[PDB]
Amino acid sequence: TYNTKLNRFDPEYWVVDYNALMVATIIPYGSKSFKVPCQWRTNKDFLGVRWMTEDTFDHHLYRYETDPNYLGLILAFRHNPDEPDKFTVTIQTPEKAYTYRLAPYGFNNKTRRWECLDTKYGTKRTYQADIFVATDEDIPESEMTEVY
Amino acid sequence: PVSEPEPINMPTMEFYKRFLSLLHERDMKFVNSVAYEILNFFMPDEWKQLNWKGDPALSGWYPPSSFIQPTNKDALDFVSKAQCQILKECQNLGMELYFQIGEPWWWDGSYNTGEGKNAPCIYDPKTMALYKEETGNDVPTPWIKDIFAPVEEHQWPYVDWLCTKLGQSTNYIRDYVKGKFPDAQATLLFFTPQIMSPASELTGRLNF
Amino acid sequence: VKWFTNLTVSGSGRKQLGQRKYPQVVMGMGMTSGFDDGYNLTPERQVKMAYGLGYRDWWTTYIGMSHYWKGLTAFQDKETGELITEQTVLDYPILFAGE
């Protein structure tokens, strides 16, 4: 029987899978954050930071539960895309592997809601504050890429 | 490649820094092994060992690997620089310094399946030139071409010289590393089945 | 360097998974690993798991052949050994301004 509870999307339990001809590793640095140093060499380089429902890399006495149900869950974070407008996530169901596009969201001081940028082609949903709560050190402005 | 002092990249170095910090928090000791192989695709061509024909060593992996020739000094400098780079971060924390020199030998064709099976990788132009330069003589004629074959008596002087150079290479690496970092404790990896019972006389006289 | 900062999970369903954690008594052995096998996981998972199971006082790690060194890729012409490693964009924009 399980005797301990693990938060979903815990920074210590992510894994990285990438092609050959590339070197990268994963390192957490806070209660909510981690870093993935990279070294690129070719065009075909492609890296993936994954959260797997099924635990395969743990000893039988340290594994965690497998619940495939993600209903009513919201995950918000910060990142450093080289192309901020074109950022995608590969969500894999047993029937097929889908690709979902993530669009940037920006705070609106007049209405106090996280409204998306990219008005022409984007989601038309707006989210409350308190979706994103910042307690770690932010990304340096030099590393971030500017969009809109 | 020979010019750069630090041959280890960034992600591995950060991973090793955090790894060593964690191993230091819970009292533990670290021993790092750096071997002769480097990936075949990215290896320099002059360092690679060569077969009786022109083909390089290769190995039994889906990505093939090639082995450093012991006679070359640049490759030994590369390996010792990597070991010193790791030992520096080991030294920055309050940790003792240990290191291991792993997998020194003259490659044979036993593990490789096809394309030079059971073919020794002795013959390289630079090593042959070294043999001509010192102790005189010449490389033995009809090259061995097969490890599991009878060996003529005029070939043994070459094998003994190769074994002496193999012994000298690890000593050079140890001297470099301990000179840069005193108090380090070197070691080796001895695998016994071939020590007690080698695959053949050639292997026993060549790799030990 | 890629940063994933301030991961905040909010919603109303199943925010916590169960987990097993059964520490075991100490034995004489000590743990040894390799880098090519363990580059996937965070350094904390491996160390905490190995310490939890009772391996103590020694670690020997064999650095892999494939990852620790630096490298490059380039085109090499067959006629002459010329290496091309850099890329460029050739384009001729023309600006139309007025009424």
Add this chain to the structure above:
Amino acid sequence: FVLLPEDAKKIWADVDKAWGLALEAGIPHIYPWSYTQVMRDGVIYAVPKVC
């Protein structure tokens, strides 16, 4: 050494016998070979049952 995990049991029994001989000889430090194989096969150390 345990490759092809379908051969785990025989090789791990041989490992037990080898560890017994090594303990009899008196070696100070002993290592299971790898983290990957140990976590994959679920090796644990326990006193044998008495029956």
